[PDB]
Design a protein around this ligand. Structure first.
Ligand SMILES: NC[C@H]1O[C@H](O[C@H]2[C@H](O)[C@@H](O[C@H]3O[C@H](CO)[C@@H](O)[C@H](N)[C@H]3O)[C@H](N)C[C@@H]2N)[C@H](O)[C@@H](O)[C@@H]1O
Ligand SMILES: Nc1nc2c(ncn2[C@@H]2O[C@H](COP(=O)(O)OP(=O)(O)O)[C@@H](O)[C@H]2O)c(=O)[nH]1
Ligand SMILES: [Cl-]
Ligand SMILES: [Cl-]
Ligand SMILES: [Mg+2]
Ligand SMILES: [Mg+2]
Length: 297
Protein backbone atom coordinates (compact mmCIF):
# COMPACT_ATOMS: atom_id res chain seq x y z
CA UNK A 1 0.00 0.00 0.00
CA UNK A 2 2.28 2.76 1.31
CA UNK A 3 4.88 1.18 -0.95
CA UNK A 4 3.05 1.87 -4.18
CA UNK A 5 1.61 5.20 -3.02
CA UNK A 6 5.06 6.54 -2.12
CA UNK A 7 6.44 5.71 -5.57
CA UNK A 8 3.44 7.34 -7.23
CA UNK A 9 3.54 10.54 -5.21
CA UNK A 10 7.33 10.92 -5.38
CA UNK A 11 7.36 10.69 -9.16
CA UNK A 12 4.08 12.47 -10.04
CA UNK A 13 3.61 15.75 -8.13
CA UNK A 14 0.17 16.29 -9.69
CA UNK A 15 -1.29 13.19 -8.00
CA UNK A 16 -2.66 13.70 -4.48
CA UNK A 17 -3.81 10.30 -3.26
CA UNK A 18 -7.13 10.27 -1.39
CA UNK A 19 -7.99 6.62 -1.92
CA UNK A 20 -6.19 3.52 -3.07
CA UNK A 21 -7.62 0.09 -3.65
CA UNK A 22 -6.56 -3.15 -5.29
CA UNK A 23 -8.10 -3.45 -8.76
CA UNK A 24 -6.77 -6.66 -10.31
CA UNK A 25 -3.75 -8.77 -11.04
CA UNK A 26 -2.56 -11.29 -13.58
CA UNK A 27 0.60 -13.26 -14.20
CA UNK A 28 2.62 -10.18 -15.12
CA UNK A 29 1.13 -7.10 -13.48
CA UNK A 30 -0.47 -5.80 -10.31
CA UNK A 31 -3.04 -3.04 -10.83
CA UNK A 32 -4.35 -0.60 -8.22
CA UNK A 33 -6.98 2.13 -8.50
CA UNK A 34 -6.10 5.61 -7.20
CA UNK A 35 -8.86 8.13 -6.42
CA UNK A 36 -11.34 5.87 -8.22
CA UNK A 37 -9.95 7.25 -11.49
CA UNK A 38 -6.34 6.20 -12.18
CA UNK A 39 -5.06 2.71 -12.74
CA UNK A 40 -1.43 2.25 -11.70
CA UNK A 41 -0.02 -0.95 -13.13
CA UNK A 42 3.17 -2.50 -11.76
CA UNK A 43 5.08 -5.34 -13.48
CA UNK A 44 5.68 -8.46 -11.41
CA UNK A 45 8.92 -9.54 -13.14
CA UNK A 46 11.51 -8.56 -15.72
CA UNK A 47 9.34 -10.30 -18.32
CA UNK A 48 6.51 -8.03 -17.21
CA UNK A 49 8.88 -5.07 -17.57
CA UNK A 50 9.72 -6.11 -21.14
CA UNK A 51 6.04 -6.45 -21.99
CA UNK A 52 5.25 -3.05 -20.47
CA UNK A 53 8.05 -1.40 -22.45
CA UNK A 54 6.42 -2.88 -25.56
CA UNK A 55 2.98 -1.56 -24.54
CA UNK A 56 4.43 1.90 -23.84
CA UNK A 57 5.54 2.11 -27.49
CA UNK A 58 2.70 0.19 -29.14
CA UNK A 59 -0.46 1.50 -27.51
CA UNK A 60 -0.10 5.16 -28.60
CA UNK A 61 0.17 3.96 -32.20
CA UNK A 62 -2.93 1.75 -31.85
CA UNK A 63 -5.30 4.28 -30.21
CA UNK A 64 -6.24 5.89 -33.52
CA UNK A 65 -6.68 2.55 -35.31
CA UNK A 66 -9.23 0.82 -33.05
CA UNK A 67 -12.84 1.67 -32.18
CA UNK A 68 -12.64 0.60 -28.55
CA UNK A 69 -10.88 2.36 -25.74
CA UNK A 70 -7.45 1.01 -24.78
CA UNK A 71 -5.08 2.10 -21.99
CA UNK A 72 -3.40 5.45 -22.52
CA UNK A 73 -0.38 5.78 -20.28
CA UNK A 74 -0.28 9.35 -18.96
CA UNK A 75 2.15 8.62 -16.13
CA UNK A 76 5.37 6.74 -16.88
CA UNK A 77 7.33 5.85 -13.76
CA UNK A 78 10.39 3.89 -12.77
CA UNK A 79 11.13 1.59 -9.85
CA UNK A 80 14.82 1.49 -10.74
CA UNK A 81 16.75 1.15 -13.98
CA UNK A 82 14.93 -1.20 -16.33
CA UNK A 83 11.81 -1.48 -14.13
CA UNK A 84 8.99 0.74 -15.44
CA UNK A 85 5.44 1.25 -14.22
CA UNK A 86 2.53 3.24 -15.59
CA UNK A 87 -0.65 5.06 -14.78
CA UNK A 88 -3.69 5.46 -17.01
CA UNK A 89 -7.24 6.70 -16.64
CA UNK A 90 -9.37 3.65 -15.87
CA UNK A 91 -10.80 2.10 -19.00
CA UNK A 92 -14.42 2.47 -18.11
CA UNK A 93 -17.07 -0.20 -17.97
CA UNK A 94 -17.75 -3.56 -16.40
CA UNK A 95 -15.24 -6.32 -17.06
CA UNK A 96 -17.27 -9.04 -18.76
CA UNK A 97 -15.27 -12.03 -17.47
CA UNK A 98 -15.86 -15.67 -18.22
CA UNK A 99 -19.03 -15.87 -16.33
CA UNK A 100 -20.24 -12.80 -18.21
CA UNK A 101 -20.82 -14.04 -21.76
CA UNK A 102 -22.67 -17.13 -20.53
CA UNK A 103 -25.58 -15.05 -19.21
CA UNK A 104 -25.90 -12.53 -22.04
CA UNK A 105 -28.96 -12.41 -24.33
CA UNK A 106 -28.78 -12.98 -28.07
CA UNK A 107 -28.88 -9.37 -29.26
CA UNK A 108 -26.05 -8.37 -26.91
CA UNK A 109 -23.92 -11.36 -27.91
CA UNK A 110 -24.51 -10.54 -31.58
CA UNK A 111 -23.36 -6.94 -31.11
CA UNK A 112 -20.35 -8.02 -29.04
CA UNK A 113 -19.39 -10.56 -31.72
CA UNK A 114 -19.55 -7.86 -34.40
CA UNK A 115 -17.42 -5.46 -32.36
CA UNK A 116 -14.83 -8.13 -31.57
CA UNK A 117 -14.67 -9.11 -35.24
CA UNK A 118 -14.04 -5.46 -36.10
CA UNK A 119 -11.34 -5.13 -33.43
CA UNK A 120 -9.56 -8.25 -34.71
CA UNK A 121 -9.85 -6.92 -38.18
CA UNK A 122 -8.24 -3.64 -37.15
CA UNK A 123 -5.33 -5.48 -35.52
CA UNK A 124 -4.90 -7.53 -38.70
CA UNK A 125 -4.76 -4.30 -40.73
CA UNK A 126 -2.13 -2.64 -38.52
CA UNK A 127 1.28 -2.34 -40.26
CA UNK A 128 3.44 -5.20 -39.00
CA UNK A 129 6.66 -3.21 -39.52
CA UNK A 130 5.36 -0.39 -37.31
CA UNK A 131 4.52 -2.88 -34.56
CA UNK A 132 7.97 -4.50 -34.82
CA UNK A 133 9.59 -1.05 -34.55
CA UNK A 134 7.61 -0.60 -31.29
CA UNK A 135 9.15 -3.73 -29.76
CA UNK A 136 6.43 -6.23 -30.72
CA UNK A 137 8.20 -9.60 -31.12
CA UNK A 138 7.76 -11.83 -34.15
CA UNK A 139 6.64 -15.18 -32.72
CA UNK A 140 6.82 -18.11 -35.11
CA UNK A 141 3.92 -20.09 -33.66
CA UNK A 142 4.98 -23.42 -35.17
CA UNK A 143 8.36 -23.19 -33.44
CA UNK A 144 6.77 -22.11 -30.14
CA UNK A 145 4.54 -25.20 -30.15
CA UNK A 146 7.53 -27.40 -31.02
CA UNK A 147 9.36 -26.08 -27.95
CA UNK A 148 6.20 -26.65 -25.90
CA UNK A 149 5.96 -30.28 -27.01
CA UNK A 150 9.51 -30.86 -25.77
CA UNK A 151 8.71 -29.35 -22.40
CA UNK A 152 5.63 -31.45 -22.05
CA UNK A 153 7.57 -34.62 -22.70
CA UNK A 154 9.99 -33.75 -19.98
CA UNK A 155 7.89 -32.12 -17.28
CA UNK A 156 4.28 -33.18 -17.94
CA UNK A 157 4.28 -36.70 -19.39
CA UNK A 158 5.56 -38.35 -16.17
CA UNK A 159 2.44 -37.07 -14.38
CA UNK A 160 0.00 -38.58 -16.85
CA UNK A 161 -1.76 -41.77 -17.52
CA UNK A 162 -0.26 -43.11 -20.72
CA UNK A 163 -3.67 -42.76 -22.40
CA UNK A 164 -3.67 -38.98 -21.72
CA UNK A 165 -0.08 -38.85 -22.98
CA UNK A 166 -1.24 -40.59 -26.16
CA UNK A 167 -3.97 -37.95 -26.54
CA UNK A 168 -1.52 -35.07 -26.12
CA UNK A 169 0.94 -36.57 -28.61
CA UNK A 170 -1.93 -36.93 -31.09
CA UNK A 171 -2.90 -33.27 -30.62
CA UNK A 172 0.67 -32.02 -31.05
CA UNK A 173 1.17 -34.20 -34.13
CA UNK A 174 -2.18 -33.16 -35.63
CA UNK A 175 -1.06 -29.54 -35.45
CA UNK A 176 2.58 -30.02 -36.44
CA UNK A 177 2.06 -32.29 -39.47
CA UNK A 178 -0.68 -30.26 -41.23
CA UNK A 179 0.37 -27.19 -43.27
CA UNK A 180 -3.29 -26.16 -43.23
CA UNK A 181 -2.63 -25.30 -39.56
CA UNK A 182 1.07 -24.39 -39.47
CA UNK A 183 1.30 -21.99 -42.43
CA UNK A 184 -0.11 -18.49 -41.94
CA UNK A 185 0.41 -14.86 -42.85
CA UNK A 186 1.64 -13.14 -39.66
CA UNK A 187 -0.29 -10.20 -38.24
CA UNK A 188 -0.33 -8.08 -35.12
CA UNK A 189 -2.35 -10.01 -32.51
CA UNK A 190 -3.50 -9.01 -29.03
CA UNK A 191 -2.17 -12.35 -27.79
CA UNK A 192 -4.29 -12.71 -24.64
CA UNK A 193 -7.78 -11.90 -25.91
CA UNK A 194 -9.91 -13.28 -23.09
CA UNK A 195 -13.11 -11.79 -21.63
CA UNK A 196 -11.38 -10.77 -18.39
CA UNK A 197 -9.97 -8.02 -20.67
CA UNK A 198 -13.28 -6.94 -22.27
CA UNK A 199 -14.80 -3.78 -20.81
CA UNK A 200 -18.50 -3.34 -21.53
CA UNK A 201 -21.39 -0.94 -21.15
CA UNK A 202 -24.35 -3.27 -21.54
CA UNK A 203 -26.63 -0.22 -21.21
CA UNK A 204 -25.62 0.55 -24.81
CA UNK A 205 -27.67 -1.89 -26.88
CA UNK A 206 -25.87 -1.43 -30.18
CA UNK A 207 -22.30 -0.81 -28.94
CA UNK A 208 -21.80 -2.79 -25.71
CA UNK A 209 -18.02 -3.31 -26.05
CA UNK A 210 -16.25 -0.18 -24.82
CA UNK A 211 -12.67 -1.20 -24.07
CA UNK A 212 -9.90 -3.78 -24.29
CA UNK A 213 -7.02 -3.96 -21.80
CA UNK A 214 -3.73 -5.87 -21.29
CA UNK A 215 -1.73 -5.88 -24.54
CA UNK A 216 1.31 -7.43 -22.85
CA UNK A 217 1.17 -10.53 -25.08
CA UNK A 218 1.00 -8.51 -28.31
CA UNK A 219 2.98 -10.28 -31.01
CA UNK A 220 3.42 -10.63 -34.75
CA UNK A 221 1.99 -14.12 -35.04
CA UNK A 222 -0.87 -16.24 -36.34
CA UNK A 223 -4.10 -14.16 -36.29
CA UNK A 224 -6.06 -17.34 -35.56
CA UNK A 225 -4.43 -17.40 -32.12
CA UNK A 226 -6.69 -14.51 -31.07
CA UNK A 227 -9.61 -16.95 -31.12
CA UNK A 228 -8.12 -19.21 -28.40
CA UNK A 229 -9.83 -17.63 -25.37
CA UNK A 230 -12.98 -16.81 -27.29
CA UNK A 231 -13.30 -20.56 -27.76
CA UNK A 232 -12.14 -21.53 -24.26
CA UNK A 233 -14.01 -18.82 -22.31
CA UNK A 234 -16.86 -17.61 -24.53
CA UNK A 235 -17.78 -20.92 -26.17
CA UNK A 236 -17.91 -22.32 -29.69
CA UNK A 237 -21.22 -20.74 -30.70
CA UNK A 238 -20.02 -17.22 -29.91
CA UNK A 239 -16.63 -17.88 -31.48
CA UNK A 240 -18.30 -19.02 -34.71
CA UNK A 241 -20.32 -15.77 -34.72
CA UNK A 242 -17.10 -13.73 -34.54
CA UNK A 243 -15.57 -15.86 -37.30
CA UNK A 244 -18.60 -15.33 -39.52
CA UNK A 245 -18.52 -11.54 -39.12
CA UNK A 246 -14.82 -11.66 -39.98
CA UNK A 247 -15.54 -13.62 -43.16
CA UNK A 248 -13.51 -16.66 -42.20
CA UNK A 249 -13.95 -19.69 -44.46
CA UNK A 250 -14.38 -23.37 -43.55
CA UNK A 251 -15.20 -22.83 -39.90
CA UNK A 252 -15.09 -26.55 -39.07
CA UNK A 253 -11.39 -26.64 -39.97
CA UNK A 254 -10.70 -23.30 -38.28
CA UNK A 255 -12.47 -24.40 -35.08
CA UNK A 256 -10.38 -27.58 -35.09
CA UNK A 257 -7.22 -25.47 -35.43
CA UNK A 258 -8.26 -23.19 -32.56
CA UNK A 259 -9.21 -26.22 -30.45
CA UNK A 260 -5.63 -27.46 -30.88
CA UNK A 261 -4.43 -24.10 -29.53
CA UNK A 262 -6.84 -24.64 -26.61
CA UNK A 263 -5.20 -28.01 -25.87
CA UNK A 264 -1.78 -26.36 -25.94
CA UNK A 265 -3.06 -23.62 -23.62
CA UNK A 266 -4.10 -26.28 -21.10
CA UNK A 267 -0.57 -27.75 -21.26
CA UNK A 268 0.87 -24.28 -20.80
CA UNK A 269 -1.33 -23.67 -17.78
CA UNK A 270 -0.10 -26.88 -16.15
CA UNK A 271 3.52 -25.95 -16.91
CA UNK A 272 3.01 -22.64 -15.09
CA UNK A 273 1.75 -24.55 -12.06
CA UNK A 274 4.75 -26.87 -12.20
CA UNK A 275 7.08 -23.86 -12.41
CA UNK A 276 5.33 -22.34 -9.38
CA UNK A 277 5.50 -25.65 -7.44
CA UNK A 278 1.81 -25.22 -6.56
CA UNK A 279 0.25 -28.61 -5.87
CA UNK A 280 -3.32 -27.28 -6.09
CA UNK A 281 -2.53 -25.66 -9.45
CA UNK A 282 -0.79 -28.83 -10.66
CA UNK A 283 -3.80 -30.96 -9.70
CA UNK A 284 -6.16 -28.44 -11.32
CA UNK A 285 -4.11 -28.42 -14.53
CA UNK A 286 -4.03 -32.21 -14.73
CA UNK A 287 -7.82 -32.17 -14.39
CA UNK A 288 -8.15 -29.55 -17.14
CA UNK A 289 -6.11 -31.78 -19.47
CA UNK A 290 -8.42 -34.72 -18.75
CA UNK A 291 -11.43 -32.49 -19.43
CA UNK A 292 -9.90 -31.27 -22.71
CA UNK A 293 -9.64 -34.88 -23.93
CA UNK A 294 -13.16 -35.73 -22.74
CA UNK A 295 -14.64 -32.65 -24.41
CA UNK A 296 -13.02 -33.30 -27.80
CA UNK A 297 -13.45 -37.09 -28.10
N1 LIG B 1 -8.40 -19.15 -14.25
C1 LIG B 1 -8.81 -20.51 -14.55
C2 LIG B 1 -8.49 -20.80 -16.02
O1 LIG B 1 -7.12 -20.48 -16.27
C3 LIG B 1 -6.64 -20.84 -17.57
O2 LIG B 1 -7.20 -19.99 -18.57
C4 LIG B 1 -6.92 -18.59 -18.52
C5 LIG B 1 -5.49 -18.30 -18.98
O3 LIG B 1 -4.59 -18.78 -17.97
C6 LIG B 1 -5.25 -16.80 -19.18
O4 LIG B 1 -3.97 -16.54 -19.77
C7 LIG B 1 -2.86 -16.52 -18.87
O5 LIG B 1 -2.24 -17.81 -18.87
C8 LIG B 1 -1.84 -18.23 -20.16
C9 LIG B 1 -1.24 -19.63 -20.04
O6 LIG B 1 -2.23 -20.52 -19.52
C10 LIG B 1 -0.79 -17.28 -20.72
O7 LIG B 1 -0.45 -17.72 -22.04
C11 LIG B 1 -1.34 -15.86 -20.72
N2 LIG B 1 -0.33 -14.94 -21.21
C12 LIG B 1 -1.83 -15.49 -19.32
O8 LIG B 1 -2.45 -14.20 -19.26
C13 LIG B 1 -6.27 -16.23 -20.17
N3 LIG B 1 -6.02 -14.81 -20.37
C14 LIG B 1 -7.69 -16.46 -19.65
C15 LIG B 1 -7.93 -17.96 -19.48
N4 LIG B 1 -9.30 -18.17 -19.03
C16 LIG B 1 -6.95 -22.28 -17.95
O9 LIG B 1 -6.51 -22.51 -19.29
C17 LIG B 1 -8.44 -22.53 -17.84
O10 LIG B 1 -8.76 -23.88 -18.16
C18 LIG B 1 -8.85 -22.23 -16.40
O11 LIG B 1 -10.25 -22.43 -16.27
N1 LIG C 1 -11.97 -2.15 -14.62
C1 LIG C 1 -10.69 -2.11 -15.03
N2 LIG C 1 -9.86 -3.09 -14.60
C2 LIG C 1 -8.56 -3.05 -14.97
C3 LIG C 1 -8.04 -1.99 -15.83
N3 LIG C 1 -6.74 -2.25 -16.02
C4 LIG C 1 -6.44 -3.38 -15.34
N4 LIG C 1 -7.55 -3.85 -14.72
C5 LIG C 1 -7.68 -5.04 -13.87
O1 LIG C 1 -6.37 -5.43 -13.47
C6 LIG C 1 -6.15 -6.77 -13.92
C7 LIG C 1 -4.67 -6.96 -14.17
O2 LIG C 1 -4.28 -6.15 -15.27
P1 LIG C 1 -3.64 -6.86 -16.58
O3 LIG C 1 -3.13 -5.77 -17.48
O4 LIG C 1 -4.61 -7.82 -17.25
O5 LIG C 1 -2.42 -7.67 -15.91
P2 LIG C 1 -1.71 -9.04 -16.42
O6 LIG C 1 -2.80 -10.01 -16.82
O7 LIG C 1 -0.88 -9.50 -15.24
O8 LIG C 1 -0.85 -8.63 -17.59
C8 LIG C 1 -7.03 -6.91 -15.15
O9 LIG C 1 -7.31 -8.27 -15.48
C9 LIG C 1 -8.27 -6.19 -14.67
O10 LIG C 1 -9.00 -7.01 -13.76
C10 LIG C 1 -9.01 -0.97 -16.27
O11 LIG C 1 -8.66 -0.03 -17.00
N5 LIG C 1 -10.27 -1.10 -15.83
CL1 LIG D 1 1.04 -22.32 -27.91
CL1 LIG E 1 -6.62 -34.52 -32.95
MG1 LIG F 1 -4.43 -9.69 -17.99
MG1 LIG G 1 -0.84 -9.31 -19.49
Amino acid sequence: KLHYTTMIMTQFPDISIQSVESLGEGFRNYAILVNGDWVFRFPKSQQGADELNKEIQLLPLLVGCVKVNIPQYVYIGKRSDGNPFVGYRKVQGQILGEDGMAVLPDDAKDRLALQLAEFMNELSAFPVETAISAGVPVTNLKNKILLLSEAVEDQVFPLLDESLRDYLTLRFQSYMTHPVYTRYTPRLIHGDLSPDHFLTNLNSRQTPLTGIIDFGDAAISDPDYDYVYLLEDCGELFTRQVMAYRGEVDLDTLIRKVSLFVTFDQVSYLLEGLRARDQDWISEGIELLEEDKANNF
